[PDB]
Design a protein around this ligand. Structure first.
Ligand SMILES: NC(=O)c1ccc[n+]([C@@H]2O[C@H](COP(=O)([O-])OP(=O)(O)OC[C@H]3O[C@@H](n4cnc5c(N)ncnc54)[C@H](OP(=O)(O)O)[C@@H]3O)[C@@H](O)[C@H]2O)c1
Length: 249
């Protein structure tokens, strides 16, 4: 076989900032060729790619709107670094809505970025990946799919759908492509979160600590390195999904 990292081109969606960037830089530093997909963060993406290449790694930037036609995205990437073998579906939209005031326009976007696009890209990767190569899809989801609540209604349904799809994609794409997932908990402040709000939330986690950014790339590599694993998720969440103390107790 030939599963050495130099022969495992990676596509990370929304890879130019924050968690996506941490994954990109971890994989690139371990010798994976990496395609950094981005949209609004082109400047950042190019900077990351330049640094990797100057350090002797292998990186490129691809640009696409994951709510438009994404049927060309895998090919943009493979044209640069070779057939995509490891797909990280990291890109996301995290907007609040609730029952009683649902806007089907925002609903549609959530399902576009978290469900439609990841499935389409997994489909496209499979079609283009040579038959003598095994592949891996890692979906970046959200710990809340393991502890359902009514907040962020359409967001939550779209992320939970991605977790459901992690199972059914794993079943559909086996044996050649494995599909696993990471469910982050509080990792970086969520735009609507001030630092104090983030720190307080973390202090309330069962483990009282946030996942460290290196854990994300380590987990992608863990899935890559242990070939008996498919259809499964690790919550890098400080135990958030196991929180249990509700007012009724
Ligand atoms: N941060 C946390 O603590 C946390 C907690 C739970 C779950 N998660 C999940 O972990 C993953 C990473 O978190 P994050 O906070 O780092 O994500 P993010 O910053 O909110 O966004 C990541 C990327 O998604 C891309 N994106 C969104 N819509 C796009 C579109 N139509 N077309 C192309 N790109 C689009 C963007 O790329 P461009 O910027 O280039 O446009 C954006 O940079 C996400 O899936 C998130 O849902 C994170």
């Amino acid at each position: 076989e030939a599963r050495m990292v130099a022969n495992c081109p990676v596509l990370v969606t929304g890879g130019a900032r924050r968690i996506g960037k941490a994954i990109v830089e971890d994989l690139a530093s371990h010798g994976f060729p990496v395609a950094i997909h981005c949209n609004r963060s082109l400047d950042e993406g190019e900077a990351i790619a330049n640094r990797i290449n100057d350090s002797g790694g292998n990186a490129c930037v691809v640009q696409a709107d994951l709510e438009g036609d994404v049927r060309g995205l895998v090919k943009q990437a493979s044209d640069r670094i070779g057939p995509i073998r490891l797909l990280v579906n990291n890109a996301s939209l995290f907007q609040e809505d609730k029952v009683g005031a649902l806007d089907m326009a925002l609903w549609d976007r959530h399902f576009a970025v978290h469900l439609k696009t990841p499935v389409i890209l997994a489909e496209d990767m499979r079609k283009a990946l040579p038959e003598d190569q095994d592949g891996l899809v890692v979906n970046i989801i959200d710990q809340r799919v393991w502890k359902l609540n009514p907040q962020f209604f359409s967001y939550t349904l779209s992320k939970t759908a991605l977790w459901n799809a992690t199972r059914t994609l794993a079943q559909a794409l086996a044996p050649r492509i494995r599909v696993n997932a990471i469910a982050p908990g509080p990792t970086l402040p969520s735009e609507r979160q001030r630092p104090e709000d983030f720190e307080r939330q973390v202090s309330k986690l069962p483990l009282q600590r946030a996942p460290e950014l290196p854990e994300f790339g380590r987990t992608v590599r863990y899935f890559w390195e242990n070939r008996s694993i498919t259809g499964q998720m690790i919550a890098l969440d400080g135990g958030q999904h196991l929180a249990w103390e509700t007012p009724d107790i």
